[PDB]
Amino acid sequence: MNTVPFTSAPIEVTIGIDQYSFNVKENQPFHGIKDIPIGHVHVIHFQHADNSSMRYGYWFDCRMGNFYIQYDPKDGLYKMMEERDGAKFENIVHNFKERQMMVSYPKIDEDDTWYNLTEFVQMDKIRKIVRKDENQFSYVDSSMTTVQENELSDPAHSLNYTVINFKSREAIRPGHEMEDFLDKSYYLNTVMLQGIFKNSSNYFGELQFAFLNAMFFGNYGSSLQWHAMIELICSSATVPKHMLDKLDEILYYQIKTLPEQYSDILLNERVWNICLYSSFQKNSLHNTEKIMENKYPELL
Amino acid sequence: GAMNSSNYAELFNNDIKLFVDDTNVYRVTVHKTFEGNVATKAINGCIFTLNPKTGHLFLKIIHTSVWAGQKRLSQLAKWKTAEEVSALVRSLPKEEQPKQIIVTRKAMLDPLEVHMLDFPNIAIRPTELRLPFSAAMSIDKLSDVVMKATEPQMVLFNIYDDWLDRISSYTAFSRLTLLLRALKTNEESAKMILLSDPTITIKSYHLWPSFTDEQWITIESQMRDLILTEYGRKYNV
């Protein structure tokens, strides 16, 4: 069990940790989150009471160091920072707990939600998508654009997702035009899985990271990226049986976790109706399809 | 973007472009089998690839043999079309390759686009115009070379004959499309109108009769009257 202390809370803000969140009042005495389960990634995120625009936050893994939050009045936001003085940090953490000014990461013991949503997400892969290698944690916000988006401006702030494009030379072998465009198995398995991602866990990892960025910050390019990585799988006739099974699980917990009120921007009607009902893999997403129909039969 | 009545005159500027029409690529007759089921038989088809500015027509004949042992032929037809158009572009010298290709049916965008990935600077466009190029097989000489062919073959024509010696591209194209529209709405009347007078012949190297300027006026008037009549009949107006 690990802790992320806060120096103070000077401005009224909604604080999220993973799928949980708490309202903190201006200069309320709030000084961190404790009992954060070791062994997974995490994200702490923010939405100022005054600007219901730009959600922002930090991906981190407490095994990589001691991290804390501090509001910057110049830049106007809660920054994540690393304390390198181990002793000085346990000192802060212990005194805040003694004074009982920290909230406890509120995990029910039956609940595998966060594990299900982060199964294949690994901090090292995150820091390649969000390059800022002087920090061990990774900042994302609502407005960051992806590499693919920029191609059709500032690179220091880009989401370097793997570029997927169905009408590209990469995707289409010469002489197999019709074949590869109707059956994407050679793009998926040779180009992407064996070639770039190396294995299915890194592919899934990026897919899940993209989803959570969409969900927690409303990052539109992230939503684009998630949809494309589903569509590539569903539009391949030849997919390993273990990837299909895992995907149905992955997508189920993602659909289960989405706020009900957000289904309109976060779910692309075409891709979902294609994947669940028209694609090669229409019959391989039994749980994803059941929960989509009982929860959002309008989109379909 | 898409081609419509607004940006109609771009067809006649000096940017090389081609129309591609695929309606006659996969042609079948439907018939009953001995056991009373329905079956199709394919006949030869053709891609209708046309420079509206110069009248040059690239008539690529599709031989029935290309369908042999293939499934989902109507879907394959679109990709075979896109394959052949791409090959045509590849065969042309650079200065003759088009800057735009305009497909008359939207279903051809993705297959052409995919086949043209080596040419990212050629734009593939749809159109909102309801062009009548399916009646191309109503032109006697085009139907004849398609139906005689014994293998894939490409046949070059100028679809305007020698009209450009005397009228503009713009007027040439509106003549062509009026003729095709009429052939499409009522082939029998349309062809009647064209050949009534046996003293106006078709040059061996031409597709249409050698009408004088004034006889074209009367012809175009006869075609317009035809098209409106058929409209009333169709709709009870």
Swiss-Prot record, chain A:
Residues 244-265 are annotated as: Leucine-zipper. It holds the Pfam family AAR2. Phosphorylated on serine and tyrosine residues. Keywords: Cytoplasm, mRNA processing, mRNA splicing, Nucleus, Phosphoprotein. The modification Phosphothreonine is found at T257. One of its GO terms (cellular component) is cytoplasm. Heterodimer. Interacts with PRP8 (via RNase H homology domain and MPN domain), competing with BRR2 for the same binding site. Component of a U5 snRNP complex that contains at least the U5 snRNA, PRP8, SNU114, AAR2, SMB1, SMD1, SMD2, SMD3, SME1, SMX2 and SMX3, but is not a component of the U4/U6-U5 tri-snRNP complex. Component of the U5 snRNP complex that is required for spliceosome assembly and for pre-mRNA splicing. Involved in splicing pre-mRNA of the A1 cistron and other genes that are important for cell growth. Present with 7330 molecules/cell in log phase SD medium. This is A1 cistron-splicing factor AAR2. The lineage of its organism: Eukaryota, Fungi, Dikarya, Ascomycota, Saccharomycotina.
From Swiss-Prot, chain B:
Changing D22A: Reduced growth at 30 degrees Celsius. Strongly reduced growth at 16 degrees Celsius. Strongly reduced growth at 35 degrees Celsius. Changing D21N: Reduced growth at 30 degrees Celsius. Strongly reduced growth at 16 degrees Celsius. Residues 7-237 are annotated as: RNase H homology domain. It is found in: Nucleus. Component of the U4/U6-U5 tri-snRNP complex composed of the U4, U6 and U5 snRNAs and at least PRP3, PRP4, PRP6, PRP8, PRP18, PRP31, PRP38, SNU13, SNU23, SNU66, SNU114, SPP381, SMB1, SMD1, SMD2, SMD3, SMX2, SMX3, LSM2, LSM3, LSM4, LSM5, LSM6, LSM7, LSM8, BRR2 and DIB1. Present with 468 molecules/cell in log phase SD medium. The MPN (JAB/Mov34) domain has structural similarity with deubiquitinating enzymes, but lacks the residues that would bind the catalytic metal ion. Contains a region with structural similarity to reverse transcriptase, presenting the classical thumb, fingers and palm architecture, but lacks enzyme activity, since the essential metal-binding residues are not conserved. Functions as a scaffold that mediates the ordered assembly of spliceosomal proteins and snRNAs. Required for association of BRR2 with the spliceosomal U5 snRNP, and the subsequent assembly of the U4/U6-U5 tri-snRNP complex. Functions as a scaffold that positions spliceosomal U2, U5 and U6 snRNAs at splice sites on pre-mRNA substrates, so that splicing can occur. Interacts with both the 5' and the 3' splice site, as well as the branch region. Has a role in branch site-3' splice site selection. Associates with the branch site-3' splice 3'-exon region. Also has a role in cell cycle. This is Pre-mRNA-splicing factor 8. The chain holds residues 1836 to 2069 of 2413 of the full protein.
